[PDB]
């Protein structure tokens, strides 16, 4: 998971993107999210941030089907601090998110659907 910050250069603050392995309750407080695999993404320094989701799972091949509650990581950003703003910027900016597999990513049993 890569995130590109699209906010006014002159602004700063700190964010924390976090992961939480299969099964665990969605970490609702920073303090919780802070415990799992996570990176502190400084807005000021680098606009982009890549946080790889390791392959932490039971079976050799993780089920790609619609299961009851398959697990299943948890990528989520948190207000480490609260956004610092320069003089008079619109104060509201966005971030975009990108996802991609890795060279160690595979698939089997060609299934389908079309209508």
């Amino acid at each position, epitope marked *: 998971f890569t995130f590109l910050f699209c906010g006014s250069m002159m602004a700063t603050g700190k964010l924390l993107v976090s992961y939480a392995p299969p099964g665990a*309750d*969605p970490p*609702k407080k920073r303090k919780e999210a802070m415990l799992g695999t996570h990176v502190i993404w400084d807005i000021g320094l680098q606009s982009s941030c890549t946080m790889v989701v390791p392959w932490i799972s039971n079976t050799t091949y993780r089920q790609t089907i*619609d299961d*009851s*509650f398959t697990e299943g990581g948890y990528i*989520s950003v948190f207000y480490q601090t609260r956004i610092v703003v320069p003089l008079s910027t619109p104060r509201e900016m966005d971030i975009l998110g990108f996802v991609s597999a890795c060279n160690d990513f595979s698939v089997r049993l060609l299934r389908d659907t079309t209508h």
Partner: nanobody, 122 residues
Framework: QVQLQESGGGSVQPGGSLTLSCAAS????????MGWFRQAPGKENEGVAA????????TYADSVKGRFTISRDNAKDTVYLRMNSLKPEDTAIYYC???????????????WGQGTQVTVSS
């Protein structure tokens, strides 16, 4: 996948109340939680109430704190929005959605609804 219908929406009165509800599909509401967003006409989505299913602990927005209530029944597959002491601003396009949990945050909710309009000061 899951298509939960927003029920209980109607035009009431100032100082009044109104019960809202959303029935599950695709899954049993019990795993995902459920909440409500009142996107006031011409303004952004506005968080009001959220509650976790398999771990009941409610969260309210400060603009509606104390007056507004939210409850759940995982057995009837429905989520119960109790809006109390309703006022003229409380006239918005209400919405129910399912997320993780239980955290009024513009999103962090998956499947939404159709939009039920509660015109308090009718």
């Amino acid at each position: 996948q899951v298509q939960l219908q927003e029920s209980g929406g109607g035009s009431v009165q100032p100082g009044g109340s109104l019960t809202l509800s959303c029935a599950a599909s695709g899954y049993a509401v019990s795993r995902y939680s459920m909440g409500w967003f009142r996107q006031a006409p011409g303004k952004e989505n506005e968080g009001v109430a959220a509650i976790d299913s398999s771990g009941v602990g409610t969260t309210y927005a400060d603009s509606v704190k104390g007056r507004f209530t939210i409850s759940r029944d995982n057995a009837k597959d429905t989520v119960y929005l109790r809006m109390n002491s309703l006022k003229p601003e409380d006239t918005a396009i209400y919405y129910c959605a399912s997320g993780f949990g239980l955290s009024l945050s513009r999103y962090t909710y998956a499947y939404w609804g159709q939009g039920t309009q509660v015109t308090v000061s009718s």
